[PDB]
């Protein structure tokens, strides 16, 4: 038996071992062909038609490259063909649990539709994996290639979700600790999933990627850090790591949190809410699930994809009128309208428990201005976006180990002051976007007065356009002028 | 009134006129987001997730580039804003008629489901364009921006499908003849649709593009050729024009006619045929249409997209069983198996009316070999692919006009023997691929012996691997050495 | 007369007006073919073989794109073909005054050869432009295309060096003020020269570019600011402008100030100092000049290119032995050895008058360790590098104007707090690199100890590898751990 | 420890320290001062790249191909030692290039030294010898497990072929396939091409059609006529025809560009007029000329693109003629392109005839009234042989393939098994004519002689023939 070759525009010709092919050629993996990587970003960036499927191949490919690289350079690590496959499998499978429109589903749909449940795509990836394995006769095929399903299935799932329950992992011991850093690096977020999506999202969005993962791979080594074996970067490359998270943040600003992309994701989510009662997805034993409950049964979830959008769009059932009308207004580009953007100030930190209350606050504002129409809470959306370097307030580069040229086996720490003064002083912040559902000229004018008035009242930053959109309101606030 | 900017990975930041934006923001154009450009090719090239929507924006942009370039260099042509917009609209809309999986629908499915009808995506584009214009109050918007609907609608349709019936066109006179060479060039095939898909398909497939469309635009001029003002290429660019069609042929060979890609298209088509009695598509006044009759009402056709594939795959209806199973086999990768490729020799052409007879002819071969199983006509698929330079046996470069540096207004002609001896002798050929529906080790062995024997019997070329797949058959034929 | 097309790998097919062709085809322009853009950088990045010539074509191209784009969108500015040509010429001739190995020459060599005189490549470009025009008969050709020599030459020089002495410019009035911001923007540094070197350097270096100059041009508008017409960016592009300076700093970190690149430049400069007396360059009327004095006569400077490197390398005269040995060490790669890098803490900064004393300070450190050799001051090279966003301590985005979508003719200001808390808190810093001229294991061992001890004594930052290269030294300083 | 180098084409390349010692010599570093495409840079301003970085990439790619063969097929017994000798050959096959690359051994040496037979390959072998001996590389080689007696011979043989029956001494015939990596004499499918396709394209602003990585992935070693050879996958045969189509296309667009070539020619004339006056020092202190530097490697080491500027900046009265030609280049006062034509039917122009062609053009008698009469010396006639690397032969007839169902069995694939759309011929000649007199009247005359001459010889009708010579082309019925 020989390898399958697959051509990918990002990575070129990738070789896939027959076990990986077996996993890929299943309904549970192929499902990822019908889930757009960037959700509603396709409706803003017309090149972003790419799906989770090809992203997963790439992650699997890169996990293999990193593990081979480490193995060829340091044979004393005892990296086995078995470890390589298990890392490739984890990389292939870490995106299995995504739902329709990727981050729209667990980021917006599930939290509103079922506020009580605790669901992430990572948890889904682990459940969908198990389902893939059992439904498809994968265990014997693993054994055929030297894998041991008892330990290795555990290893794979641990790589995706972390500790399943003082070394906390059963899949592998502390001397393979570095394997846990490849696919999903819980310590600092420097992993191959980022490296595929940087290169791949840039290719499709029409933005260029400034981070060189192949250079990182050539400089990476394993060293003993606090009695674990860990992946270490070369000292003088610390600048590139900082830039890696800078790039992540700027891809979030330019594309992933695009103000129209997010409002499209919001309109899609609203339509899913209105359709949730009347759509049925046949699960295991012929049982019936909703869009919001297909997450409890992997056989139903298997069939939950972006197709839901077009089920609703093309439906004739009058119970779906409301859902269908909202999708129709997306097609006509009759979208909820962007009013503006602001941030908090000092150490105001807007908590999740207060998200529901923000539209009422905006409608409660009392601008000293004569207004033709008057707007209510229902007429406002307030979207709160938590921008960070992947570790809330923490600097992930403080959780990175390095080595120097003169003694490559010796791990060292590097602080922000040892690198540059031109680096960020904070590593997290919030943006607040405000939109109005009432879109004629007179409503939009009013929305802008209320909005800027509210920014004034809450001591938020002056919107960039504030003097233009609300010249009677911005003189009131001393901090602004 | 301002231009929308859109960012395209192929062309960068494209500007859209408000009238173009009102056309794009309709159900009839937006449906092109759910039709893959390369149909089944996504299932072989994982980067080829792109859809018809982004290709159409590009054709529209490049149509505008070529018409602006001509207008700037040659003001005497009297090219107006109005002409520019109609060329852009024809370019944006020339792909409106595509069905599910693009060329699969009009090249595999409709010929087999509706043999009696003359259907092309071109004729669909015109029907869909009229439906788009009437359904969305576009005629007053055209008038708002200085177009004259009865004249300009005719012009737009003529650019897409040719004369609607001296000078055969009603929309513009012969002094504007060159404008009909931009979006769909019936004389020699050199047009902006090709240029967009060379660049876009190559970006997504992972095969680099070798044709430079920007260089062609820099050198393009309008000259008088037999009493019409036509587009002329610079003399010493003739070589790049030959390379253009060489590139087109190369992409057909590597990607568009990939042997697995074509058989996935075949399987899907099969699923669609078995499903066609049962799928209802709701059209005008709530009447119901079939997949095969959606082409008869544009309201229904508006809703006929790649969605149909997943409607079938996720159906529970027992009546859709056989269709659903074929699509499920695609997911497991249990595909009909490729047996080999051959071509006709000498004078033999194979006409479209002989296609049905071929699986029978393969089944009737009598290979002199020990064969465990016996295969019937219904076990074989025979795909006949007509490969050419866009004009059957004709050299399209014989239908291009050139100018020289010393007399830029004087059109000339250039023959093949004035360019190079390293150019093709013929400009059309046929490939014949044979596949087997039974996929076991023994049926496949038999399939190979029938196929190679059939090749020998019909005097076709020796398959490349023929001495390996049937070592006992290929000795018999002296022509094969 | 028609346009020359040139194919550039960065911009594609650029059209050049016949006047521009005439300026280009002179010894004074063609000179730039023999001057490497990145100096000694090619000896580290083997892709960086590019010369100032192609970069100059690119700057002129982009200068025309920006002026044409402003003209098309805003006809009310009265941009004439005259203005376009002059801006293009200023763009082409901006780099005429570079010397051998570009920034090496005016950044290292001239300051050490002729400490008293003050020479910049900007003034060199103005003096070389004049000599180009005068020696080649360009004035009459200017007039043949409707330029007015006395106004327009003044305008061209002014766009390069700024005012030649309260509206300070003679070449154009205040109502064309925006034209002074295209080629060399003295207010904030946002200009087309950067845009060309970002794309070009990246293409050659093998590092990818994050900045989209074409997006910036699409969003640019001229608006009234303090009673001046200025170029304004769209408000919500403010983040991209910050990203632009971030990309510049990043290229300086990775490439332009590479530690080995800089030392090669330093070694080359040392060879030129040793050669300076003996190399003769013939200027106006057979007067003889040195490498250091060819900047006084433009006929000599025309003949001063990277060729100097090879004339020294290939020489056999005993007078040049010392120069020739240093260049031979470059070939053998027996370079001065990098010791390490630190930065100053607090807001101490090292003034340019202290730079000479710094090698003596390093030799005067007394690390408490067995050293087999003592090093003297002349064994050390100390390279101090100012990193900023182009305006020393200042935020150049404070000197940029913006407009918003609701009133596109109203200029506004945006402050750093209106953008992001993730931005740099400072805009300038110093790097200090230390190298040793004695390269054997013992001397380098000692240099590391002198070095780290000198960092400790001065309260500079702990070198990243300090614990590894000087473990007997770093324990003394409590703050380091 | 490896050194890492960032190349824009290939990315981060790892160099074994033995490679680094070869590279860090005067003999290898001189390749920094020799442009890959010669006078091409004077037409394509992106093509500033030199032979140095091309050499690195051929070295990297030779390494990639041998490694990949070793990993896929351990039964070939490819050792670390074999990998290093193949990387060195790859690295060193360009060492013998002279100023402006193909200008030097294509134009200047054949005119200045017609007596001698000289190629850049021979020069790469002589330069490699000098590199080794001048820099103490033999003991460094021993230190990494190489054996200089055998391994120097193997490296040389990889560049130049056999140095006089299995013809090779550097390796036995079980390692036959290793001779097919750096410079493949059987069919021209080697890594030198792959690097230049990608590199030249990147700098020229033309996009490359060929996927070398895909080729490496599908490559295998099989036995073919009692010899191990690199074989390709059967279905990749179309890609191989494409590779040669790409090569020809790059020749047409860039390497034989009508002005690039005429700049090479002018530079070549400059070097001919300077040859008596430039002196370059060699071993034992002996002086050599531009034309005789090839006889002494210590002198040849100092002979690079710098000679062009030494001539351009010179003050010596004796160099004035050579200096003026180079100054004509700066001012863009070039010899003028007149046109292009080809022979017809079986006609083939012989290399002994090239000299006489300008006499033929000047001796033509166009029926047109002319102000100027032009002599033989006013014309340059450039004959360019365009092929698929093997004169009239199809290189894909010399490639071995394997199919999926029997990967160890070599097969042959004929052109009719592939496509009817492929070339029927694999070689042709282009004839370009230029005039050294550049005034409008001379150029108009040059055009009438040229088209008359094409008509006399029954060559192809130039493409612009009815426009440039409307009074000459109606005489020829074959043309209309
Ligand atoms: N010339 C060419 N053909 C295919 N191709 C892409 C498609 C796919 O991503 C990858 C492997 O395709 P290939 O056709 O080699 O594989 P297949 O499985 O059909 O053939 P087999 O080896 O089983 O006969 O490359 C590609 O980029 N270029
Ligand atoms: N930083 C960045 N933003 C957007 N963008 C892409 C997306 C889209 O194809 C094109 C225009 O987006 P923009 O955000 O400018 O338009 P929008 O309509 O949302 O803003 P408006 O002008 O209405 O306020 O650019 C892009 O590539 N990079
Ligand atoms: N096929 C091809 N040829 C040239 N070329 C590049 C080189 C050069 O930068 C630009 C213009 O070259 P061209 O050959 O068109 O100009 P030339 O001046 O020799 O021809 P003329 O028009 O005077 O006859 O394009 C290019 O990319 N591809
Ligand atoms: N950030 C960055 N730096 C360098 N670089 C390029 C230059 C060069 O071709 C290759 C290796 O450079 P590096 O700086 O890593 O090596 P050097 O020999 O100086 O460091 P050492 O390891 O000896 O300390 O990469 C690169 O692309 N990006
Ligand atoms: Mg296959
Ligand atoms: Mg908008
Ligand atoms: Mg020309
Ligand atoms: Mg180093």
């Amino acid at each position: 038996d020989t390898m399958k070759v697959i051509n990918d525009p990002i990575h070129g010709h990738i070789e896939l071992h027959p076990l990986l092919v077996r996993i890929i050629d299943t309904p549970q993996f192929q499902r990822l062909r019908y889930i757009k990587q960037l959700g509603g970003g396709y409706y803003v960036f017309p090149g972003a038609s790419h799906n989770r499927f090809e992203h997963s191949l790439g992650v699997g490919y890169l996990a293999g490259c990193l593990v081979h690289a480490l193995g060829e350079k340091q044979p004393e690590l005892q990296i086995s063909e078995r470890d390589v496959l298990c890392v490739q499998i984890a990389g292939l499978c870490r995106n299995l649990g995504h739902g329709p429109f990727s981050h729209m589903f667990d980021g917006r749909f599930i939290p509103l539709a079922r506020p009580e449940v605790k669901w992430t795509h990572e948890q889904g990836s682990v459940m969908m994996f198990e389902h893939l394995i059992n439904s498809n006769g994968i265990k014997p095929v693993m054994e055929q290639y030297g894998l041991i399903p008892e330990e290795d299935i555990c290893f794979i799932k641990e790589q995706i979700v972390g500790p399943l329950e003082l070394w906390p992992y059963k899949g592998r011991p502390e001397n393979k600790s570095f394997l846990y850093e490849i696919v999903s690096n819980k310590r600092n977020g420097i992993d191959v999933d980022k490296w595929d999506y940087f290169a791949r999202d840039c290719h499709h969005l029409g933005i260029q990627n400034n981070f060189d993962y192949k250079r990182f791979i050539k400089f990476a080594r394993v060293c003993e850090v606090d009695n674990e074996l860990r992946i270490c970067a070369r000292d003088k490359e610390v600048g590139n790591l900082y830039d890696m998270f800078h790039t992540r943040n700027s891809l979030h600003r330019r594309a992933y949190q695009h103000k129209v992309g997010n409002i499209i994701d919001t309109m899609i989510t609203d339509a899913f809410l209105k359709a949730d009662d009347y759509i049925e997805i046949t699960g295991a034993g012929g049982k019936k699930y909703r869009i919001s409950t297909a997450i409890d049964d992997m056989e139903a979830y298997t069939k939950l994809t972006d197709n839901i959008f077009l089920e609703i769009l093309y439906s004739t059932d009058p119970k779906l009128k409301d859902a269908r009308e909202i999708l129709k207004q997306i097609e006509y580009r009759n979208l909820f309208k962007y009013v503006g953007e602001t941030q908090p100030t000092g150490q105001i930190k807007i908590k999740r428990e207060d998200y529901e209350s923000l539209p009422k606050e905006v409608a409660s504002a009392k601008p000293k201005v004569l207004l033709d129409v008057k707007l209510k809470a229902e007429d406002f959306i307030v979207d709160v976006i938590n921008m960070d370097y992947g570790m809330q307030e923490k600097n992930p580069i403080d959780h990175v180990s390095f080595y120097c040229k003169t003694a490559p086996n010796r791990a060292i720490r590097i602080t922000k002051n040892q690198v540059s003064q031109l680096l960020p002083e904070k590593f997290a912040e919030q943006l607040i976007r405000v939109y109005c559902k009432k879109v004629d000229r007179k409503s939009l004018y009013a929305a802008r007065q209320y909005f800027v008035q509210w920014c004034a009242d809450r001591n938020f930053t002056k919107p960039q356009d504030g003097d233009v959109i609300a010249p009677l309101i911005t003189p009131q606030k001393k901090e602004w002028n």
Side-chain angles (χ1 to χ4, degrees), chain A residues 41 43-46 205-207 250 253-255 258-261 333 337-338:
Chain A
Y43 296 91
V44 173
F45 290 90
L205 289 160
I207 292 174
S250 100
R253 291 289 196 130
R254 295 167 177 186
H258 188 281
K259 70 193 195 300
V260 181
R333 215 66 173 192
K337 293 295 303 198
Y338 173 73

Side-chain angles (χ1 to χ4, degrees), chain A residues 181 185-191 245 389 391 396 399-401:
Chain A
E181 293 191 299
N185 184 322
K186 308 300 190 195
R187 187 185 326 289
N188 56 47
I190 303 172
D191 60 55
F245 289 93
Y389 277 28
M391 292 195 92
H399 298 282
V400 174
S401 280

Side-chain angles (χ1 to χ4, degrees), chain A residues 42-82:
Chain A
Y42 184 37
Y43 296 91
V44 173
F45 290 90
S49 55
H50 61 304
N51 298 304
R52 289 272 161 191
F53 178 76
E54 50 269 32
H55 175 58
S56 307
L57 298 183
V59 178
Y61 167 75
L62 294 174
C65 295
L66 179 47
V67 75
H68 285 111
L70 290 170
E72 291 286 278
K73 285 220 297 188
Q74 297 175 257
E76 83 280 3
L77 291 177
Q78 312 280 59
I79 296 166
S80 76
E81 224 260 289
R82 194 182 142 186

Side-chain angles (χ1 to χ4, degrees), chain A residues 190-352:
Chain A
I190 303 172
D191 60 55
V192 300
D193 187 93
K194 287 188 173 67
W195 307 343
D196 186 80
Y197 86 64
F198 290 1
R200 189 172 309 276
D201 297 336
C202 290
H203 190 76
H204 289 83
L205 289 160
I207 292 174
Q208 276 214 149
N209 165 24
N210 179 262
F211 180 65
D212 185 347
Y213 65 85
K214 291 177 215 195
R215 177 175 181 88
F216 185 99
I217 288 176
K218 290 234 175 290
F219 287 84
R221 277 185 72 77
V222 186
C223 308
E224 166 251 274
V225 180
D226 302 342
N227 267 241
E228 258 170 59
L229 295 189
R230 268 177 238 185
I231 298 184
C232 299
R234 175 62 189 276
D235 49 2
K236 76 189 177 64
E237 300 295 300
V238 57
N240 295 341
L241 273 47
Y242 274 101
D243 287 340
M244 196 204 75
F245 289 93
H246 175 101
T247 295
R248 176 168 171 285
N249 189 67
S250 100
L251 290 167
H252 273 273
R253 291 289 196 130
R254 295 167 177 186
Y256 313 144
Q257 308 298 337
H258 188 281
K259 70 193 195 300
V260 181
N262 289 359
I263 213 60
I264 285 161
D265 274 338
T266 298
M267 295 171 75
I268 291 173
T269 294
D270 283 344
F272 277 27
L273 292 170
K274 301 224 164 85
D276 195 34
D277 294 332
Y278 322 102
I279 292 283
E280 46 191 66
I281 315 181
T282 295
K287 209 148 190 300
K288 302 284 192 211
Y289 291 89
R290 303 181 167 190
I291 302 153
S292 57
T293 57
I295 57 146
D296 307 324
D297 175 45
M298 293 307 94
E299 207 180 304
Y301 199 54
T302 294
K303 305 190 274 161
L304 180 56
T305 72
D306 291 10
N307 191 57
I308 283 302
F309 174 95
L310 300 170
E311 221 148 294
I312 297 159
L313 185 59
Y314 298 158
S315 60
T316 75
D317 181 339
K319 289 337 303 247
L320 287 166
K321 246 286 274 285
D322 279 7
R324 183 165 62 245
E325 288 270 44
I326 290 167
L327 301 193
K328 280 174 180 199
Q329 289 335 291
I330 296 178
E331 299 207 294
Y332 293 99
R333 215 66 173 192
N334 179 18
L335 304 179
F336 304 152
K337 293 295 303 198
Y338 173 73
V339 179
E341 183 170 42
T342 200
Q343 301 186 261
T345 258
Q347 52 188 61
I348 303 289
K349 152 70 182 203
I350 292 175
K351 227 284 108 107
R352 186 168 290 281

Side-chain angles (χ1 to χ4, degrees), chain A residues 4-7 13:
Chain A
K4 215 159 277 288
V5 193
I6 229 283
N7 192 20
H13 286 75

